[PDB]
Structures are given as C-alpha cells and as structure tokens.
C-alpha cells in the first residue's frame, strides 16, 4: 500500500554517544528479522544495506562537544540516503545507533517533505546546544541543529555546515520527558514547544495525550509525520538495554497504543529507532526483551494492531 512501503536504512553508528555497542543496533535488529516479520502483512520491504561510515582519526573536538566531524559526515551520508529513499515514495525506516543519526534522517526527509512534523519520543528533549551542554555528546544535541529558532544560537560546529534548520518550534511534539536538563527545560519554556512529559501522560492517559498530539500536529493540516523514537522513553522494565536508562518511562502497552494511532493516521512518513545497545544487557534476556520491544513497536508502526489484522478476503472457505 501507500503505507507500509518501507525503505530500510541500517546505521551501525556510535560516535555521538560514549558507550560503544549501539553499532550492533541494526545488526541485532536485522538478525532479529524485522524484514520477515514485516513480510507477512503487505509490506514492500526493501533494505538498502548499511551505510559505510568513514573513521576520521583526526576528529578534533569542540570545547565540550566531542567527535563533531565523523558524526557530521555520518549524518550527511545519511541525509543523502534518506532523501534518496524518500524519492522512491517509500517510508524511510532508519534505525541505529543514536540520536545523532536523526539529524540526517530529518534532514533528508525535509529535503523531500519540507512540511513535515516530528514526534520525538524520548526520555530526553535532546535539545542541548554546544554551549548549554554538560557532556557535549551529540546524541544529546540533535534537535538544536534542526530548529530554525536556534539559528545563530548554534555555533559553527565542524562537520555540520550542510545542516539546514528545517522545522519550527510548533513543528515538534515531545512525548515521554522525564530527564530534562535546566538548559533543556529553559529552552523548552522559551520557544513554547508543545510537549508531553510523564506528568501530563499520568494525568490525561495515553489516549488523551495521543488525541491532543494528533490534534496539534494534524488537526491544522495533514502533513507527513516523522516519528523519531527513543527506546528509553519506554520503561526500562521493558527496555533495560538502552544507552540512557531512566526509570519511570512509558509502558509497553502505551507505546504500542501510540504506534497504533500513528498507523491509523496513515501519515507516517519516516521512522527512527535509536539507542539500541545489546552490550548494555546484563543478561541476554534483557537484550531479548528490548529487541522484541523495539521490533513490536516497529510492527505496530506498520500495521500490526493488537486487535488483529487480516488480508481482506474470505477465510471461511
């Protein structure tokens, strides 16, 4: 169909976060066999392989921001690949990896659809600047490069000269905030970005939150929706093998309801699955649950309803 027409982009990338091991994100998810789990239902599955990311040894850092240039080269390569696969009319499934990849993901998606919107599901806002950071890790700084309102507030980071800020403060909705920096919360209150922390989800319920989210983004104008997802926004009871484990996250049922409502919009146009670290699994059972969680999220993004799904023909024959 128009929905569940998939270009698969694997990015075995880790250089925007400290703990190496999310390079085996697409490796484990492909050996979890997301492709075959799509191929039952009417999915136009087409992988495009993994991207060859060069290793620049002289990736000289910024003041606090470390590894700018290899990350910028990675996201520029990924922006080309995402724009390429969205020329195909597919839905850009990109998965890594960490949030630094989402820069080029949203970039190449905005090259095709400049009118997009972002649902950034994450424990964090990841809205840090090079100035307002504490770690300098670019997986904590993807969003600030992509916001038009932080133009001039973004320093000239080596490797991100190609980056064009493509969305506005109204173009993005956060869901799942429970680990927010004072700089992050100050910027969030500064730009007036619509968000949904764990407080409002516990207040309204996940149905009312998803209702208000789709009313905010698609109630004005039906536009392509780029769900960019972090696994730590779900509770680490389900996803302990994530890079930034923060307790008190969303439930597995809640995330499945989110992705089912996104599929029932049908305006999903790009999916980003990051922070998948099998090396942070204390048991392989932890890895197994986390990977199955991410796969089931992706399947419910591409039509796997919990109520059941069938090919529209008679079965009583």
């Amino acid at each position, epitope marked *: 169909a128009k929905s569940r027409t998939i270009g698969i982009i694997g990015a075995p990338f880790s250089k925007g976060q400290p703990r190496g091991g999310v390079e085996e994100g697409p490796t484990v998810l*492909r*050996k*979890a*066999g997301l*492709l*075959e*789990k799509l191929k039952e239902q009417e999915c136009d599955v087409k992988d495009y392989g993994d991207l060859p990311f060069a290793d620049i040894p002289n990736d000289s850092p910024f003041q606090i921001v470390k590894n700018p240039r290899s990350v910028g080269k990675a996201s520029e390569q990924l922006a080309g690949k995402v724009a390429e696969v969205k020329k195909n009319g597919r839905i850009s499934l990109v998965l890594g990896g960490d949030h630094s990849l989402a820069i080029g993901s949203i970039s190449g998606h905005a090259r095709v659809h400049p009118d997009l919107g972002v649902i950034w599901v994450d424990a964090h806002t990841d809205i840090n600047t090079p100035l307002t950071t504490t770690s300098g890790n670019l997986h904590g700084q993807p969003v600030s490069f992509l916001l038009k309102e932080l133009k001039g507030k973004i320093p000239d980071v080596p490797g991100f000269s190609w980056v064009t800020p493509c969305i506005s403060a109204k173009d993005i909705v956060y869901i799942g905030l429970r680990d927010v920096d004072p700089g992050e919360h100050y910027i969030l209150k500064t730009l007036g970005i619509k968000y949904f922390s764990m407080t409002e989800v516990d207040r309204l319920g996940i149905g009312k939150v998803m209702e208000e989210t789709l009313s905010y983004l698609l109630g004005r104008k039906k536009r392509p929706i780029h769900l960019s997802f972090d696994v730590d926004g779900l509770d680490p009871s389900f996803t302990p093998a994530t890079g930034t484990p923060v307790v008190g996250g969303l439930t597995y049922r809640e995330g499945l309801y989110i992705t089912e409502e996104i599929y029932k919009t049908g305006l999903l146009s790009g999916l980003d699955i990051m922070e998948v670290n099998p090396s942070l699994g204390k048991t*392989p*059972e932890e890895v*197994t649950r986390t990977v*199955n969680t991410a796969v089931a999220i992706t399947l419910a993004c591409f039509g796997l309803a919990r109520e059941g799904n069938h090919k529209p023909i008679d079965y009583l024959n």
Partner: antibody
Framework: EVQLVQSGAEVKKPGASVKVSCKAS????????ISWVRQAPGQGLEWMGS????????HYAQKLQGRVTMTTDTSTSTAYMELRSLRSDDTAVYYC??????????????????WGQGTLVTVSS | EIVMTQSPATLSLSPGERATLSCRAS??????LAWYQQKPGQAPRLLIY???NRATGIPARFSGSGSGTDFTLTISSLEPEDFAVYYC?????????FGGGTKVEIKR
C-alpha cells in the same frame, strides 16, 4: 527438505565457547522452536535448551543455566548455542533439532524432526 | 524430570518376528512422547511421533502403544537394516527427558 546444517566440529581446551551454526533449510522459520541436545558418546542424550525462534524463550535445562547462552539469527535461519567456562564433561556430540514453538499460531510438533547431523565437541586440553 | 526407563536394556535378535520394545515413564505422559532411531555414528531419526501414528515415511512395521505410563515400540517385521539404538523421549514436561538406550543386536 526440512533439514539442519550444523557447523562445525571443534574442540576447546577448557576455554571459550563452541558456538555452533545450526543452519535451518527447507522449512520456514519463526514458527518452529529449535532445541539443542547434547549426547556424550556411548551415553544417553541430554536436552539442554530450546529457544522460541521469534520472541526467544530460552528454557535452559538443569545443571547449566548459566554456562549456556542460545541466540537466534533469523536473517538466515541459523541458530546458535554457546557455553561458558568449558569443561571435560563437554565431550559430546551436540545435536540441534526443533521442538516446534509452543506459541499460539505455531503448528503442532513434539518430536524433533529437522534433525541436525551432529557436531564433534570434546573438551580438549 | 520424569525418569524414562526402557525395559529392554539391550536386545539381540537374529532377523525375524516381532521384536517389540518397551519404555516406562515415572509419571503419566499420556501419549505425548516419541520414538527415535539413533543409528551408530549417525544423527537420530524420528520413528513414532506421538506414541503411535508412524511418522512420515516409516515403512510398514513400526507401531507402538502406551497411554500413559509404560509405552511400547513394536518392531514386528524386523528388517535387519533397523539395528540401531532406540529411544523413547518424553516431551510434554520440562525438562524433556530422553530414554536409556535400546541397542538392538543380532542373536548366530
């Protein structure tokens, strides 16, 4: 046919694992839970673990819980089983076979018929 | 951990009539176990899958009974290519105990 390509016969002294590719062929995956069974030569057989293919449910057997780790590779339907802190008790021909998944949509099997051909592992110093 | 006791330890039979074999369970398996054909130096092969019903290309002579403690395996029409170590093995209880070994010899 419904077949398993095991690979391959290998010994370790007391050391690291002998993770065996149990390459499935002929039959579809994610419907057919694959087990592993050791048998020392001149001895009876010992089932030692069986994953569900998708949503991997481990079900490791007694006396090695623990030392065993089993993984799935459903890109190309091979399966794997390691061992930790290998030992001279592990002089056994390791067979992988398929129980059949005890889910809801998986068809009924109880009887191990993909049969794998065996793998010579003697743990040896 | 239901102990599976095979009542013939070994067997020797110059090729001929019914060479029926036996396996007992420590509990009530209730027709939920299988029969196997571990040939020497070979991979085992399924003979009977659920206490009867003659799995998938077994020739003519390999019935069995049970239901549900002490099970039988009838080698009725011996056919001396069938000299192999045989195995009952419970399945519908974990962990999945095998039998003891049923080395079938020749009884010259």
């Amino acid at each position: 046919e419904v077949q398993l390509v095991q690979s391959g016969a290998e010994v370790k002294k007391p050391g690291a694992s002998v993770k065996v590719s149990c390459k499935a062929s002929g039959y579809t995956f994610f419907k057919y839970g694959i087990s592993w069974v050791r048998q020392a030569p001149g001895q009876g057989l010992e089932w030692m673990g069986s994953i569900s293919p998708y949503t991997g449910e481990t079900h490791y057997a007694q006396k090695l819980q623990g030392r065993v780790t089993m993984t799935t590779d459903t890109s190309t339907s091979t399966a794997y089983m390691e061992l930790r802190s290998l030992r001279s008790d592990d002089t056994a021909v390791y067979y992988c076979a398929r129980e059949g998944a005890y889910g809801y949509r998986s068809p009924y099997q109880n009887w191990f018929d993909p049969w794998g051909q065996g793998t010579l592992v003697t743990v040896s110093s | 951990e239901i102990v599976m006791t095979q009542s013939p330890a070994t067997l020797s039979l110059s090729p001929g009539e019914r060479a029926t074999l036996s396996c007992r369970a420590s509990q009530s398996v209730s027709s939920y176990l299988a029969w196997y054909q571990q040939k020497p130096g070979q991979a085992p092969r399924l003979l009977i899958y659920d206490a009867s019903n003659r799995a998938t290309g077994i020739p003519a002579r390999f019935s069995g009974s049970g239901s549900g403690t002490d099970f039988t395996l009838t080698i009725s029409s011996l056919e001396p290519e069938d000299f192999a170590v045989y195995y009952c093995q419970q399945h519908s209880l974990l962990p999945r105990t095998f039998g003891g070994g049923t080395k079938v010899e020749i009884k010259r």
